[PDB]
Structure formats: structure tokens, C-alpha cells
Design a binder for this molecule. Structure first.
Ligand SMILES: Nc1ncnc2c1ncn2[C@@H]1O[C@H](COP(=O)(O)OP(=O)(O)O)[C@@H](O)[C@H]1O
Ligand SMILES: Nc1ncnc2c1ncn2[C@@H]1O[C@H](COP(=O)(O)O)[C@@H](O)[C@H]1O
Ligand SMILES: [N+]
Lengths: 399, 398
């Protein structure tokens, strides 16, 4: 069986065709600037051959057609016809209270996603677009949905409950959810393996740092606590997200600037984070370079980001009464060695120590902590696509 | 030195005269029913002698001129003339920026106190009715203003700034200020003495647990991080406060419930906390009972509260790169061996352990941790008036 995993964003679309027979990633591509000028799609074959097509991509639909065209490229493709795509896995951030486990797509599931648009303004609408593009290009192909909140469902009440009037939890299902679950679960299993101990016996602090970032306290292979909550805004500072700020600032900023609830939401989700502090951009790579060239703002922005990650690391050490290892994955966590250093410096007092040199290695699963450090520090590249393709393989077969 | 600590109120006036030589409270009083009927002033002298005088107290200025009569009483007083009162210290919760240290009241220091009203969403603006009194009743005498937010002015930028648009900090002052400064500092000083080392060489985690709660990371005697922020709302769940929740919830609630800005703020500061969860009381002592009596919501509210505090202990363990001791103060922190247990259990992984027997003791400086524990856990009662007295003294010296 072959599965196309889809990851949609407002104007981007990450895809990946995986051969479930030997779980090999036949091809990995990306569509950018969907809706802007100079639309483009890049693809990389398992043999290295790369493709790039400059062609206007107005909607996620057009891009999904170019995707099928790239996948079936006579020489740079990996298949002959669209029919070779047996199923399609989709990433969906919020499924709501009702949907928290991978599920075959149906009118009902589509209802829950849209209904949750307000719970994940930056992701669900775009994920939904990908799902639609999909239905407009390959209607006959089975579709499975995998939710970011799934993995965090084993949290205890004293953790997912907010200290608000109890009726809010009943009247509106307002509780902590968490996201990036599918990623936190994958790298967590990887850590258990690099530890040599069985999952049930390990205590790990997984760190997903990308456009969005979140930490999770995995005990015995199960999420017991996570940085994000009701929505993907709570927690760490991110690309354009403010994270856990004093809530009183909302009403305050609303009165002082006379902003509407809609506006204060867009401000917290699209104009804050490192973008808001740096005043430069949301790309941590850009910020890294700009900070190293003398831009105080970019410097301050990354300073706030690493420090916040550091505090959460200490915060989950108490939760787990001692963590065996800390895991860095995702865009920033896998590639950035500099930001990683910023996050881990000054933590030898809680067992964390790292080899500055081994820490300079590229994208490789490796222990970057001193061999004597009580706490291991793995840099594990994430692979949600496989996690999603695996989930998609099961649902479609098990009826 | 002899300091007079005052605490103005709606129609009351609490005060204390402390001899800084032995930091002993010579006398302590309270003027009740001010600006109304049945005006009364009650003073207690150290050697068990209480005075109750029914003089009428129109304006606070008279309530202070009476505190003079009482402090100088032939038999119930403690001083001959008003001249023995070297300085006067009053506490003001909101100190905001500017005031990185206590300020010796004058014309300037009063402006910033009045200026900071609409520039901050605090509920109880400075009751200057107390300070005003001193302005006249006691002219040639240093009057110090101790701010509950100053102690945190040592926080670095990457800590007090929020990951919000920079313009907000620059044009509206949005940053983390923190509160309970005097208490955290007082207990942080006591902790260093208990560790038997200079404050400078100590890293301490101070915990102020009361109706309102906050945690402060103390590095070398200076505040470097604290749980509350722009307002007392941020941080832990408290008696009626929700603390740091997902910000998205605010605009969400306002939409679903059709609330106003002022309404949503009231819901988070007064209708939330352990009160909102248990739906019983904002009082922990009563919740502790209900809890052991099988009250679910009650039990749930205590788990959330203790858990949060725990999360902050580890969070600050990373900030201070290892803490030497954790301090518990304030009402819940001084008298609840129940909650302290909920908080400290399951932390041997980060070097924290407690002696159940030593944890039963109420109100008294003591190390309740085990002798093998790497992190000392002290129980230190906080003395607000003496804390403001110490503070007032130092500003009077330099
Ligand atoms: N080498 C790098 N240096 C700095 N930041 C990086 C680097 N690689 C990735 N990042 C960060 O990760 C972001 C995207 O990561 P992520 O959200 O995981 O998406 P994706 O991995 O699909 O690009 C980039 O915009 C940047 O902020
Ligand atoms: N013995 C106790 N056990 C549990 N809670 C207590 C006890 N004594 C006081 N409290 C709580 O601690 C807080 C002290 O308030 P404050 O003095 O303002 O810090 C109040 O909200 C009380 O309910
Ligand atoms: N307050």
C-alpha cells in the first residue's frame, strides 16, 4: 500500500508518498506561496533527484494537481498514475472534544473540523483546505484524519483542567488539549529506544520547536502534561504566537487600543512571538543570522524563546520527578545548534550538560550531552508523515 | 533607629512602632471607624498593656495625631516625644517601573504614584490617605514609600518582556512587574541565614502562598524571576484567580458569554481560582476539610493548586540552575502541612524531600526537609511590618 501524507498551511502544502510495504519514503515535496505571486513546488525523490516547477498555484486544489503531476513525473516521479495512491493521510490540529483519535473521513468529521476553526484559527482552516483540494483531485481515494490532540488524551484532570469556574469545562468543554501530539509520540518512542529501556519505564521531556513549539512530559510513553492548551497559542513563545502571557493583558489591551475580540486574537496569534519582538520576521533562521550580525531585536527575540523553553524543561522535571532525557526535534530543534545551546546552557544543576562540539552535528539522531551528564539530550529528527501514514494504513484496512 | 510602619485603609489605620536595634515591636495599634461614628483607637504595648480610647476620628490626619498621643502615653505608650520616631514607612502594592527601589516621599515620588492609574489595570489604587497624613503631622521626619514590585526590578530583559509586539512595552509599559516583593525578599534574607552563608552565595526559591500567590527565583539575594507579571493575575491558580491560562480563552469566553472587558477581568480575578473549581470557597482551610470529606470539586481544586506550585519549583530550578533551598511563607505556606505535602511530594528526583514529623509544626522558622535531601526546604513566617521597617531603615541610612 502507498500513502500520501498531507500537511497544509495557509499558503503551503507539505506532501509525502510512503510505501507502506517497507515504510520507504518514495518522495517528499513542498508547495509554497499558494495564493501569492511566484508560486512553486519542489520535490525530492529517494534517489536524490530534485524537481522544481514555477507555476502559479492560486488554490490548494491547483497545488494538489501539480503534486500528482510531480509524483507521476516520468523520471523524477515515483509512480505512474494517480491510482497508485491508495490512501491519503491528513494532519489536523484540533478535532475538538468529540474527535481525538485518527478516523476515516466522513461528513461528520468534516463538521467537527470546521466547528473547531475558532479553536485553531491558524491551522484547521488550512488543513481543511488541503482536505478539500484532496477531494477535488482524488475523490476515489480513501482519506484518514489524524489529530494533533490525540496523544495528549491521557492527561490527568489536575493538569488539563484550568483554574476557572467549573461550569466552563462543562458548558463549553474548555480544558487543555495540546498539539504536535503525533510528533511528540514519535520522538518519544525514539528516545526510549536510544535509552535501551522499555517505553513504560522511561520519563522524557519531548521538545517540538518549529513554526509552532510545544514541550510535553511523557511518562511511560504517555503524555501527562504539555505546553499548549485549549488552543495552540498557550505555552512557549513561537514564530508569531505570544504563548502564556498575563491574561489580564487581553482586557487591558482591548480597552487601551479599543480592539475587538477578533483583533486581539489575530494580534496574539499572528503578530506576537519572535515576529512581534524582532519586528523582523517569524523565521528563526533569519533571526539567528540577524542576531549574529548585530540586530538587538532579533537577539532579544531568540533570547526570550530559548529561556522559555528552558523554564519548561525545569517545569517538567518536577512533573516527572526526574527526567531521563530531553528531546529536541522539528525545524528549530533538529537543525539549530545555536538556539539549542541557548536553551541548554546553565542547567548542569538539574543534570543537563552538553558537548558543544557534538551539538554542532547536522540532522542526525544523536546524544548531544556529556557521557557523565545525569540527563541525556537527544536531537531526534521528527517523522510525523510516517506516524500519519501508519495511522492511515490501519484505519483503511481495519474497515 | 525607631521606625513607624503605617497601613492606611478605607476608614481604618494600622500601625506599628519598631525599634530597629532589636527589631522589637514596642507598640502596635489600629484606628477603626474613621470618618464615621464610634471612632476608636486600640494600642497594645509589648509588656501586655492594652489601651482603648474612644476619641472621634474625622479625617485620617487626626487618626495619626492620636497615634502620637497613644505612642507617648505616660503608662501605655513607648516614647516620650514624637521625636523618637526616626522614620515612617508605608507600603504601596503597585510600584510599576521607575521605582526600582523604595523612594523617600516628596513632591516627585507622589506624581508617579498618581500617574500609574490608567497605565495599569490594578483594582486597589494607592490609598494615599495614609501618606498624606504624615506630610503634615510629622514634617521633619523621613517618610519612606515601600513598593511591593520594586524587588523584582532586577529581572533581566529576556524575562520581564513578553513575546508580544515590542510597541506594547514601549508605548504602554506592558511587561512583567511582579508582586509580594517585600515578603519574598524578607523570607529570602531569612533563608540565607538558615543556609549559613552570605545571601550573595545562595540561590533560593521563595513561595508566598495566600489568597493570592506567587513564586520568585532568588539568585544571590536578588529577584531574577517571579510568577506574577503585568498584574497579580498571572502565575499560579489562587483563591479566586485563574493564573496563567491559554490567552485565547479570554476572547473566546467574551464571545461565547457575551461579556465586557471589565466583566471578563472580574471573572478571572474574583470568580476563578480554587473558588471557581470547587464551587465551594476561596478559603483553602475550608477546602482542605471538604476535600478530606469526599468533596470532589474541593479535592480537584487542591490538586490543581499544589500541582501548579510544584511546576513552578522545577521551572525555577532551571532558572537558578539548581536551588539551595525552597521557602514557604504566607498563610497557606506557614500553616498548611497538608498542602505543603501535596506540593513537595514526588520531587526527590530534583533533590527535594521532607520530614513528615517536622512538617507538622505551624508558624516557625524551621527546615522541614530530610537531612539527606540536597535542597533545603524551610518554613519561614513572613513579618510584613518588620519587612517594611527594615526597608524603611536602609533608605533612611543611605
Ligand atoms: N538551520 C536552522 N536554523 C534556524 N532555524 C531553523 C533551522 N531549520 C529550521 N529552523 C526553524 O524551523 C522553522 C520551520 O520548522 P517546522 O515548523 O518544523 O517546519 P518544516 O520543518 O516543515 O520547515 C523555520 O521557519 C525556522 O524558524
Ligand atoms: N492552617 C491553614 N490551612 C490551610 N489554609 C490556611 C490555613 N491558615 C490559613 N490558610 C489560608 O491561607 C490564606 C492566608 O491568607 P493571607 O494571610 O492573606 O496570605 C487564606 O486564604 C486562608 O484560607
Ligand atoms: N493586590
Amino acid at each position: 500500500m502507498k500513502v500520501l501524507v498531507i500537511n497544509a498551511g495557509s499558503s503551503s502544502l507539505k506532501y509525502q508518498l510512503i510505501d507502506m510495504t517497507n515504510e520507504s519514503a518514495l518522495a517528499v515535496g513542498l508547495c509554497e506561496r499558494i495564493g501569492i505571486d511566484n508560486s512553486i513546488i519542489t520535490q525530492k525523490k529517494f534517489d536524490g533527484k530534485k524537481l522544481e516547477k514555477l507555476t502559479d498555484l492560486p488554490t490548494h486544489k491547483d497545488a494538489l494537481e501539480e503534486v500528482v503531476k510531480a509524483l507521476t513525473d516520468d523520471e523524477f516521479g515515483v509512480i505512474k498514475d494517480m491510482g497508485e495512491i491508495n490512501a491519503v493521510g491528513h494532519r489536523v490540529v484540533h478535532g475538538g472534544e468529540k474527535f481525538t483519535t485518527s478516523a476515516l473521513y466522513d461528513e461528520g468529521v468534516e463538521k467537527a473540523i470546521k466547528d473547531c476553526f475558532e479553536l485553531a484559527p491558524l491551522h484547521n482552516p488550512p488543513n481543511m483546505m488541503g482536505i478539500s483540494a484532496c477531494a477535488e483531485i482524488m475523490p476515489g481515494t480513501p482519506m484518514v484524519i489524524v489529530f494533533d490532540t490525540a496523544f495528549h488524551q491521557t492527561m490527568p484532570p489536575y493538569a488539563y483542567m484550568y483554574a476557572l469556574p467549573y461550569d466552563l469545562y462543562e458548558k463549553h468543554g474548555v480544558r487543555k488539549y495540546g498539539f504536535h501530539g503525533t510528533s511528540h509520540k514519535y520522538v518519544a518512542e525514539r528516545a526510549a529506544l536510544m535509552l535501551g529501556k522499555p517505553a513504560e519505564e522511561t520519563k522524557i521531556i519531548t521538545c517540538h520547536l518549529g513554526n509552532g513549539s510545544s514541550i510535553t512530559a511523557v511518562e511511560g510513553g504517555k503524555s501527562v502534561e504539555t505546553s499548549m492548551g485549549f488552543t495552540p497559542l498557550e505555552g512557549l513563545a513561537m514564530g508569531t504566537r505570544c504563548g502564556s502571557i498575563d491574561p489580564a493583558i487581553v482586557p487591558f489591551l482591548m480597552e487601551k487600543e479599543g480592539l475587538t475580540t477578533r483583533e486581539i486574537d489575530t494580534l496574539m496569534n499572528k503578530k506576537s512571538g519572535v515576529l512581534g519582538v524582532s519586528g523582523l520576521s517569524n523565521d528563526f533562521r533569519d533571526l539567528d543570522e540577524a542576531a549574529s550580525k548585530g540586530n538587538r531585536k532579533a537577539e532579544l527575540a531568540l533570547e526570550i524563546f530559548a529561556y522559555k523553553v528552558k523554564k519548561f524543561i525545569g517545569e517538567y522535571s518536577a512533573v516527572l520527578n526526574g527526567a531521563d532525557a530531553v528531546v529536541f526535534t522539528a525545524g528549530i530543534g533538529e537543525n539549530s545548534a545555536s538556539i539549542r545551546k541557548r536553551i541548554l546552557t546553565g542547567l548542569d544543576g538539574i543534570g543537563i550538560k552538553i558537548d558543544d562540539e557534538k551539538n554542532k552535528i547536522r540532522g542526525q539522531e544523536i546524544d548531544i550531552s556529556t557521557p557523565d551528564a545525569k540527563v541525556r539530550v537527544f536531537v531526534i529528527p521528527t517523522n510525523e508523515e510516517l506516524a500519519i501514514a501508519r495511522e492511515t494504513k490501519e484505519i483503511v484496512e481495519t474497515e
